[PDB]
Specification:
Chain A: This is Pol polyprotein. Chain A: Belongs to the retroviral Pol polyprotein family. Chain A: Residues 8-55 bind DNA. Chain A: Residues 8-55 form the Integrase-type domain. Chain B: Residues 1-139 form the Integrase catalytic domain. The complex is a heteropentamer, with one copy of chain A and four copies of chain B. Chain A is mainly β. Chain A has a single domain, classed as Roll (SH3 type barrels). Chain A contains no helices and five strands. A five-stranded antiparallel β-sheet of chain A has the order 4-3-2-1-5, with no helix packed on it. Chain B is of the alpha/beta class. Chain B has one domain (1-148): 2-Layer Sandwich (Nucleotidyltransferase, domain 5). Helix content of chain B is 36%, strand content 18%. Chain B has helices at residues 40-51, 71-79, 92-98, 107-119, 131-143; strands at 6-14, 17-23, 30-34, 58-60, 82-84. In chain B, strands 3-2-1-4-5 form a five-stranded mixed β-sheet, with helices on both faces. Chain B is flat. Classes of the chains: A mainly beta, B alpha/beta. Chains in contact: A-B, B-C, B-D, C-D, D-E. Chains D and E meet through α1, α4 and α5 of D and α1, α4 and α5 of E.
Chain lengths: 55, 148, 142, 143, 142
Amino acid sequence: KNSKFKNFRVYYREGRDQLWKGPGELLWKGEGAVLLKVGTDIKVVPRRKAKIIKD
Amino acid sequence: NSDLGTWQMDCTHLEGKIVIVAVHVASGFIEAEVIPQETGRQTALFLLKLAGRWPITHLHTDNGANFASQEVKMVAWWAGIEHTFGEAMNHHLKNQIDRIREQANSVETIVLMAVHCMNHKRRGGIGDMTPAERLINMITTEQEIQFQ
Amino acid sequence: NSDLGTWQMDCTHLEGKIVIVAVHVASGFIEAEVIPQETGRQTALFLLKLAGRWPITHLHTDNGANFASQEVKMVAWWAGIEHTFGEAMNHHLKNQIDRIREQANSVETIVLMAVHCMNHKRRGGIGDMTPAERLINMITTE
Amino acid sequence: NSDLGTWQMDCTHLEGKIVIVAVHVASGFIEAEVIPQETGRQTALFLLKLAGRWPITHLHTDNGANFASQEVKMVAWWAGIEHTFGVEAMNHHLKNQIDRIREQANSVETIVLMAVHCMNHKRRGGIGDMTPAERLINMITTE
Amino acid sequence: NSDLGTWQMDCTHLEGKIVIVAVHVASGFIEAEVIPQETGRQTALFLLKLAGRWPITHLHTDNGANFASQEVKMVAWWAGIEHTFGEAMNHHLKNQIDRIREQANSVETIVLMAVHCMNHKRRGGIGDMTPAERLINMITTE
């Protein structure tokens, strides 16, 4: 298919509070984490503290 | 915490009844009903009922004689739910029921009626998913990852 | 190929215990429990439990005191269901029991054990889709 | 056992004509045409015309023209089909697509073709972008 | 050099009857059947069926009722299939027919067997793969 969707919004929800953390762009490639580009800043996140959604 | 397979089972009392509760930590999918006794048999029989429909994998509980029985041991393993022992979308369980309490007599019927209203009431906008609709958007998104 | 929220509630007994059942017609997904007696309460109360989690608009059903419960009617409107054009699934859940029939001692547990397996019996009329994996795909595209 | 080659056949009547459809179950890829007499020889040539292109493993159907037909018997023996345990609504979807696009071409024969194109090459997905024509090749060319 | 989209076709007779053949130049896939008359209708009909199955993005033929054919234009437009004015693979078709001639009576069943064989007869030319295995591959490669 070589051309991934990218219509996914992923806000990195850790645990310091219930403040939604601005839906980043998903581009993960692995399993134990979640690499996510926000603007330009790429942020790998530990699975347990992330939340991805579509559309 | 918000691992897509994470569910939490609180157990309570309401009107002299015992209300078992389970929340999908990553969304707000409340699942609950009245169990005639606070016991592993019931807690296993509930987790099982929960295991048999949602892509669950993590059950976070808060270590009590209830969710630490052999009955919940067998089920958990049998379905592959690694347990991890330790009120909000369980607090508003008692609340939202009060704004329903009349609609039907029994606590049984009333706690179920409660999860309906509870499961279908949207949040804000720009990601306006009701509890129920969002859960499916989260489960499905995992799958939408594919094995290309 | 059916419609997103058109369920069908069966009602059969096994080993002596009553087992209410609910099949999402188009995905074959199933829901079941070991309700105490064939009273209106138990059926209404079970019907109240699908609506809590899945979209239920219509409901094929036996024209016995199943729909013939004052209570189910009382719940039919509360949520928003009907009554329409209505035994593979029961006899499937039944064959599914007979095989895993040793793991758990009881029916209350085995009928549930059964449903876990049936919701993940990968044969799919199109794509690998299991019955569970089937409705969730159905619902999302809405 | 198979999970790549079981196909399913059946037959419909459309605008006073007979339409034969062969849907690859685990892939929903359609293949349909208008066969003159609904007789054992047309079912056989279809089945065959089909078998000499896609690696059809097993087949399934009701009885009458499909199976009693020894013509099919020979043509299924020759290529190596088979029929055992396992509802068909593809006709409903095929009829639909046709309905929606009936205006396009006069001939029923020519429209079941248009609709067959329009289903195969039309990505609706199911946790996968691809059209069934692409769903097929995905599996069929996975090993 | 062709590609995964270009195809070609022609219509030769076969013991009285007429036969329209079409082969995917990239591999050596032969698709063929018999047509009751060498008309413009029947040609375009063999194209319509073709396009709904395989990824045809460039047809090629000689000239006459097959080529120009208003139907073949009205059909090529519908499927985005172009056309070129204007291969020798029917000489194989016939050569494979007599070689297998006694299996079945009618020509309406002989030409079907011939293809089933030319699509499923391995060789070399940088490939163990059958003529079918080439197409089903070029289609996936892309």
